[PDB]
Amino acid sequence: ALMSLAGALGVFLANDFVVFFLSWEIMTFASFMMVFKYNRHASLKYFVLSIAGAYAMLLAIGIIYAKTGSLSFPEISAIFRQDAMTETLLI
Amino acid sequence: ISRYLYTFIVLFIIWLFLTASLDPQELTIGALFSAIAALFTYEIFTTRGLANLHPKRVLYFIAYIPYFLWAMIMANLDVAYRVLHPKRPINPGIVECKTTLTNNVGKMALANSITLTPGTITLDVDGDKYFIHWIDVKDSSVEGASEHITKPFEKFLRVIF
Amino acid sequence: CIVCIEYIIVALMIISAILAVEWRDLLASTVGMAAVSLFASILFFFLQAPDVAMTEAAIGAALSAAVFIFAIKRTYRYETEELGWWVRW
C-alpha cells in the first residue's frame, strides 16, 4: 500500500515515458497484491486486465518509438506538431 | 614363466612378418609392445609350456603346410566341378568322425583343416568325435575311420605335440 | 574400369540402405546396417582417404552393428505386427 503510492507519485511526476510505464507497472502490481489476499478469481481478473492495458501501452509506445525514432516524451509532442501540417488510428 | 617368453617369441615373429622394411632403429618399439602384450595375457598360449621349439616339429609343420594347401586347391576345384548345369546335385551329409587328440589346439586345427577341405563343414565338436556337414553321401552313414571322408590329417596333427 | 565399379558400389549401398529399413526382423536390420558400413568403408577407401576407412571399419562393422544386435538381445526381435478378435485396435 506504500509501494502503490510511489507508483502514484511516479505516474504524475512522469515527464518521460520510461519513468511512466515503470511507475504504472509498479502501481498495478501493488494494487493487485493488495487485493490478492482472498477471492483469487476477483483478484486475477483485475491483474490480467490491467496487465493487458499496461502491455498494450507498451505496444503503443513500441510503435511510437519505432515510427519517430526517439523515446523522449517532451520532444515527441514537438514532432507531432511537425507532422500536424492510417497508422495513427491504431495508436 | 618360460611360456611367457614363448608368447613373446610368437608375437615378435608376427611383428617381424607384419613390417616388410624391419629397421633396427624401429624394432625396439615393437619388441617393447610385444613384451607388454605378452605380460598382459600370457595365460592363453599354454600348449604345454615353451616345449614346442623342437626342430623336428616346426620343420614337420612347414613341410606339410603345402600338403594342406594342395588338399585345399584340389578339393575346392572338385566342388567347382560340382556346379554342373542341370546335374551333379549335392545331397547333404551329417556323417561323423571320431578323434583321439589331446592338446585342444589340435582339435581347432583339425576342425579348421576339415573346414578347408571340400565342403566338410564342422558343426558342434563334442569331446568324443566330430560332426561334419559332408557332401554327396555314398561312402558311409557312420565312418569308422577318416581316410574315406577326408585325407589323413589325423596322423600329422598327432605329432603337433 | 574406373567409374563403373564406383556406380556399382554406390547403387549397392543404396539397395542395402532401402532394404535396411524395409525388413521387420531386427537381426536382419543389423545385417543391413553392417552391409551399409561395408560399402561405406569401401567408398571411403575408394575415395582415397584410408584413415576414415579403417576407423569406420573398426567402428561400424563390429562396434556399431555388433552393439545393436547386442541391444536387441534382451529386447524384441520382430516388429510384432499382428487374425484375431481384439486386434488392430
Binding site: 498495478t28 486475477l44 502491455y55 | - | -
Partner: protein, 487 residues
C-alpha cells in the same frame, strides 16, 4: 594470456580424476565436486576481471599456430561474463546436490555434471565451427545421459525423444558444415566472415539455413522443443537447473553468433524472418501450455522455454538496441530460473513429488523457500522494479524498428497468460494452507535467499550492470572489430 586457458582443461582434468577416486572410497566423491567448481569460479573470475580491464579479449591460441589455421578461443566480453555466471550457477548446484540426489549411483554422476561444465565453457568460447560442433555434441550426450538418469519409465522415455532428435539435428548440422566448407574451404569464423560475401549466393543459403536448423534442435524453439518440457519434468533436480539455466543460452548464443557472422548475404533476411516467426510461435505455445498444467515442475518447465523464445526474438532482429539487450535477458533469466528449480527441487525432496496436491499449503508449512518461489514467480512477468521487468522492456522496445507489432503482440500476449499460471500457483501455496507442519529446512534458508537478494539489487541498480552489456554486445553486433581483434 593463455594462462587463462584452464576454463576447459581444469574441468577436464578433474572429470578424469573423479573415476580415479571412485574406488579409493565413498567419502570424498561428492565433496570433490564442490572444491573444483569453486576453482572454476576462481579461474572464471580471473578471465572476467582481465577481459573488462582492457578493451581486448584473450585470443586463447590452440598452440603455436596463429589463426585461421588453428583453433582460436575468442573469449570476448560476452564469453568471460557467461563463463563467470555458469561457474557461479554450477557452484550453486554443487552445494545443493550434496544432500538432495543421493537415491541413485552418484558414483558416476559427478563426471557427467563436470563434463556438462566442460561443454559449457567450450560452447561459449569456441572459434572454429568444428569446435562449435564438437562442444555442442559434448553437451548433447551429457544431456542424453543425464535426463535419463532416474530409470523410472517416465524418465527413461524422457531422454529417448531427445536422443533421437538431437541425433537428427547434429546430423543436419554436419551437413551444413560440409556445405559452408564446400563453398569457402575455410573453417575459422575469422576467415569465414571476411570471405562469405561472394562465395556463392545459392550455396551459402542452404548451408546457413541447415546450420541454423541443426544448431536449433539441441536448443528449443517450436518443433524441436517438446523434449525440454519432458526433460525438466523427469531429471535429477540439480541438473534441471543446469539445463534450464545454461544449455538454452549456449545454443541461443551460438545460433545468434553465427547468424551475425554472415550478415551480408542474400536469403539471410528470410532466415531471420523465419527465426522471428518461430521464436514468436514458441513464446505463445510454451507459455500457454502451462495454463492447464498439473505438475508444478512442468508448470515451470514450460515457463523456461517461453523466456528463451523471447531471447531468440531480439537476438536475431537487427544489430543493436536489443542484441546487447538480448544478452541482458540471458544473464538475468538464468538467475531467476535458478531460483525456480531450487524451490521445486526442495519441495520434491522434502515432501515428495511435484504434484500440486503435495505442493499445496506452503505458506505456514514451509519457511521462506516458498518466499523464494514467490519472489521468483513475481520476476518472470516482471511486475515491480525488478530485473526481468527491465529486461523484457528492453526486448519489447527492441522489436520496434524491424518486425513490429505482430512479433510484439504474441510475446507480450504470453506474459498476460504467464500472469495467470503463476498467481494460480502462488495463491494455492500461501492462502490455502490449513496445515501447520513446521518441517525445518534451514540449509538453504540463507543460500537461496542471498541469491534472492541478488535479484533485488539488480532490480534497483541496473546501470551498474547495463554498462557491461554495452561493451559485451560488441562481440555479436559487428564483424569488423571482431575480426581485427583476431587477426
Amino acid at each position: 594470456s593463455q594462462v587463462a586457458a584452464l576454463l576447459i582443461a581444469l574441468p577436464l582434468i578433474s572429470a578424469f580424476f573423479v573415476p580415479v577416486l571412485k574406488q579409493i572410497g565413498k567419502s570424498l566423491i561428492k565433496p570433490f565436486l564442490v572444491i573444483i567448481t569453486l576453482l572454476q569460479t576462481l579461474i572464471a573470475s580471473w578471465a572476467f576481471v582481465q577481459v573488462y580491464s582492457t578493451g581486448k579479449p584473450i585470443i586463447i591460441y590452440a598452440g603455436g599456430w596463429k589463426p585461421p589455421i588453428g583453433i582460436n578461443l575468442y573469449i570476448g566480453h560476452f564469453a568471460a561474463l557467461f563463463i563467470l555466471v555458469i561457474a557461479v550457477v554450477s557452484f550453486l548446484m554443487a552445494l545443493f546436490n550434496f544432500k538432495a540426489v543421493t537415491v541413485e549411483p552418484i558414483d558416476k554422476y559427478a563426471m557427467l555434471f563436470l563434463l556438462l561444465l566442460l561443454g559449457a565453457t567450450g560452447m561459449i568460447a569456441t572459434g572454429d565451427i568444428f569446435n562449435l560442433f564438437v562442444f555442442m555434441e559434448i553437451t548433447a550426450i551429457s544431456a542424453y545421459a543425464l535426463t535419463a538418469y532416474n530409470k523410472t519409465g517416465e524418465a527413461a522415455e524422457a531422454s529417448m525423444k531427445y536422443i533421437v532428435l538431437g541425433g537428427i539435428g547434429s546430423s543436419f548440422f554436419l551437413v551444413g558444415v560440409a556445405l559452408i566448407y564446400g563453398a569457402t574451404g575455410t573453417l575459422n569464423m575469422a576467415h569465414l566472415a571476411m570471405l562469405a560475401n561472394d562465395i556463392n549466393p545459392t550455396v551459402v543459403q542452404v548451408g546457413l539455413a541447415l546450420i541454423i536448423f541443426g544448431l536449433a534442435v539441441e536448443a528449443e524453439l517450436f518443433p524441436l522443443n517438446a523434449w525440454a518440457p519432458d526433460a525438466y519434468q523427469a531429471a535429477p533436480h540439480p541438473i534441471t537447473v543446469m539445463f534450464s539455466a545454461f544449455v538454452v543460452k549456449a545454443g541461443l548464443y551460438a545460433m545468434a553468433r553465427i547468424l551475425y557472422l554472415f550478415k551480408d548475404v542474400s536469403g539471410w533476411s528470410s532466415l531471420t524472418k523465419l527465426l522471428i516467426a518461430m521464436a514468436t510461435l514458441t513464446v505463445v505455445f510454451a507459455e500457454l501450455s502451462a495454463l492447464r498444467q498439473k505438475n508444478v515442475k512442468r508448470m515451470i518447465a514450460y515457463s523456461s522455454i517461453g523466456q528463451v523464445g523471447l531471447i531468440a526474438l531480439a537476438l536475431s532482429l537487427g544489430t543493436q538496441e536489443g542484441v546487447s539487450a538480448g544478452v541482458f535477458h540471458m544473464l538475468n533469466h538464468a538467475i531467476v530460473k535458478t531460483m525456480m528449480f531450487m524451490a521445486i527441487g526442495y519441495v520434491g525432496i522434502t515432501l515428495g513429488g511435484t504434484m500440486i496436491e503435495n505442493f499445496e499449503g506452503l505458506g505456514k508449512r514451509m519457511p521462506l523457500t516458498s518466499l523464494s518461489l514467490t519472489i521468483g514467480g513475481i520476476a518472470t512477468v516482471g511486475v515491480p522494479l525488478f530485473n526481468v521487468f527491465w529486461s523484457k522492456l528492453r526486448i519489447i522496445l527492441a522489436a520496434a524498428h524491424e518486425g513490429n507489432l505482430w512479433p510484439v503482440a504474441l510475446v507480450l500476449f504470453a506474459s498476460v497468460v504467464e500472469a495467470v499460471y503463476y498467481f494460480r500457483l502462488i495463491h494455492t501455496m500461501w492462502f490455502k494452507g490449513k496445515s501447520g507442519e513446521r518441517i525445518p529446512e534451514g540449509a538453504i534458508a540463507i543460500v537461496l535467499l542471498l541469491l534472492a537478494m541478488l535479484i533485488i539489487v539488480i532490480g534497483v541498480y541496473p546501470t551498474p550492470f547495463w554498462n557491461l552489456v554495452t561493451k559485451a554486445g560488441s562481440d555479436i553486433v559487428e564483424v569488423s572489430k571482431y575480426v581485427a581483434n583476431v587477426l
